[PDB]
Symmetry: C2
Amino acid sequence: LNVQTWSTAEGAKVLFVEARELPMFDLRLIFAAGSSQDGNAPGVALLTNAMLNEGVAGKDVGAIAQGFEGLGADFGNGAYKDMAVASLRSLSAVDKREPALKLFAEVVGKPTFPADSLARIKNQMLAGFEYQKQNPGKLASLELMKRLYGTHPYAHASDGDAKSIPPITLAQLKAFHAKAYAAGNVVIALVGDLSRSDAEAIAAQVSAALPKGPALAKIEQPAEPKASIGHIEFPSSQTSLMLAQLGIDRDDPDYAAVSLGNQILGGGGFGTRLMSEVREKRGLTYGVYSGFTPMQARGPFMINLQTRAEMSEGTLKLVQDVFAEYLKNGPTQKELDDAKRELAGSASNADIVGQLGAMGFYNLPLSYLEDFMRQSQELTVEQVKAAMNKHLNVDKMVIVSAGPTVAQKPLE
Amino acid sequence: LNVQTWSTAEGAKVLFVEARELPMFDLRLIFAAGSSQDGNAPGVALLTNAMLNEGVAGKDVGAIAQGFEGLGADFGNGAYKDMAVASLRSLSAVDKREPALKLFAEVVGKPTFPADSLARIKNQMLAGFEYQKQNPGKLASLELMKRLYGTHPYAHASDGDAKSIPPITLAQLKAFHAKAYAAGNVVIALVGDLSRSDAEAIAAQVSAALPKGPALAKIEQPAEPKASIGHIEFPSSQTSLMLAQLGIDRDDPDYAAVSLGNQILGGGGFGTRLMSEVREKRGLTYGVYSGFTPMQARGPFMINLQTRAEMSEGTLKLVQDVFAEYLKNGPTQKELDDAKRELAGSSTASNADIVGQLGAMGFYNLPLSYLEDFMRQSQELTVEQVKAAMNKHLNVDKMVIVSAGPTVAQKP
């Protein structure tokens, strides 16, 4: 496709793809306003993002939702470690998109942050922390990110904690919003039934409604953690196991190589090394997965699965052996091909706008999409093995288990 | 507003509301195909409903998904206790809705139940059962529904269990579908940018694509269970509390009165009696809710919350006292007005909200003027009428209580 890009007067990065198949369009705003920008107030980024559509001049939470619905539009939001998102899907018809866009602009650019909404959202978050202590996987991953990142901004939970949420004030949210939702801190992605002229108008309108400000400081790289094995005691006949170490950052040149290499190890299914060895041949789990989560700074590489508590010790060694062998010998030409073929089979405005968001946010080449498919079928078994060994090491894994401490049964 | 109704040549009940504001419409099919129809194969209803869009003649799961997406349409499905649904939201333009409806009819009326999809679904359902036992609330809920309904079809979990899922064959899914998804067993609800003639054609087309057959017989009423208290030992840190007894069936005349009474007792908000006493004044929980789940047969009335294990013994007594006190004196004028005001707020209804009500109207044989009657009646209820209704359907001596948590010393 023909990806077009430019910047607004306020400094926003714009990426656009014209798609006339459907009388609709997707607008996605990506801000460098993830939890990594939390500073001394864990949870403030997530709280700010969740509060956007709780109120604007003249409209309470209900009226805003009704506003979008009545116009045939869908609003979406979310906060993560690197970014925070605000999105709109709407009919392309001028009479529908105009009021939808002005409302969207008001919600993301001029939220009023109603006091009652804040109290309600905090309560939901506090209740959430309580339910979380009943989810082994959630506890294991939280522990795992702490051991992996230490004091780095990516270490703390995005939603903060019971201690940090209560003190957050409306003033802190307004201050964070003014700084992190600034035009110079955003990427405007558009895909749909629009001309480049309409796209420019839309992007400019959004950019002008946002608070004025420069981009925030980028996140530094984390220090490599030391290998370790932790355990979280939890009642259940099952045990959640997670293994991880630092992976790559989104802009790393070996992205295509490590992603294909990962597909073979623990991607979707039955065919992978892990699913066949752990699930297919031994029936020790209903699902085992592996994957990289590239961010601005080095993201984590993780392997996760659940098994019967009495088989956990044995299954862990098995996963470690499978991983060790894979890094040592790499993939077979047969696995690589099936991997490329599988990939060859994997677009809507939504899927595209999502990619444009990452392309602009991580400053990837305009040709990113094509470059990825192209680089990916070109890769040889030797390039994949080299890339995996360059970014992963068997002696760097941080392991966290969550389940009961019970007698262990060796694998049969 | 101006609900229109008729039946198709197959005996399907059709309900339609013309709404021309947006160039789209919502089609919802409600089948008497919930878990209550499981018989000797718990979970077959949910599995059949989940397999609908997994494949049709010459098309796999991904092909069907892209098919709807490329047309700007969304497919929806879900199975419950007394009903199973299949829905489609689509642009109204003929060039988009015609292809989308043909695909939709094929998906719901002629599913192929691919072998590889059934294995994938069973695998995730089996994984689901494992996750479930690590959840106190779910464990208490399953047990509570058992004590409440005994051998009644509503007692067992809709998704079946680890022992009932593996055995389910394609032959069973095929037979269940031919019986439960028969045209005579479905309600067709339509709302949107369509003329009555457009709607007639759409309904006739969907109805004709379904298997031919009559409506299934209605489920009998459950027996009044004896009051009892049960505890599920779970060494986790918080305690889950659930109280319940048989509520009303969906077409009960006091529906509006009990809905408003329940809203005041434990609906949404911090103003309810339960949230005020347990959370507001005592700070014993982050969320306590109560509610009726009216079904074809008597649905349950349930109250649920989570508290610190050491406060569970006292909190349960408090909730019971608050409940007794509420049935005894009824709601205050203030509570009644606030509730009516909240209800009123909560010609602005969207196609999705309307289509949902139309489906229930048709499935439960509610009066054609149900919508208008609900508003009128609700806004006119008196404290005396609400108190009478709640007392007519609930009794403090009939509560079945089930808690899940650790047995620890009480700190009150």
